[PDB]
Amino acid sequence: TSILDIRQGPKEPFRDYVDRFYKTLRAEQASQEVKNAATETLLVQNANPDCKTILKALGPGATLEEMMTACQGVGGPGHKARVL
Question: Which residue ranges traverse the bilayer?
């Protein structure tokens, strides 16, 4: 029931990931250093690796739209041969 549980699933869309992130955040919006703790940085940090890279390129203060746009860009399943 922690924000950690909020991760960027493989088959899970970024939207669902954000919903969870914001769901847990609002579940107990608080931390030992919320100020120092950049929520956005948490989502990105708690986000996949590639997304992290894409988010890194994004900017130190991208918008949800930009975050979702980059996430949507992230690679994935793109072929016939059923992925492992």
Answer: none
CATH label of the domain that carries residue 67 = 1.10.1200.30
Sign for the CA dihedral angle at 60, 61, 62, 64 comes to positive
Determination method here?
Answer: NMR
Per-residue CA distances from 32 to 24, 37, 41 (Å): 16, 8, 15
- Quick one: tokens of 33? 């250093």
> Which pair of structure tokens corresponds to residue 70?
């980059």
**Six-digit token string for 31:** 């931390």
Q: Name every residue whose Cβ is closer than 8 Å to that of residue 37 and which is 6 or more positions away in sequence.
A: 31
Residues in CB range of 44: below 8 A, 6 or more apart? 51, 52, 55, 56, 67
The total number of structural domains in the chain stands at 1
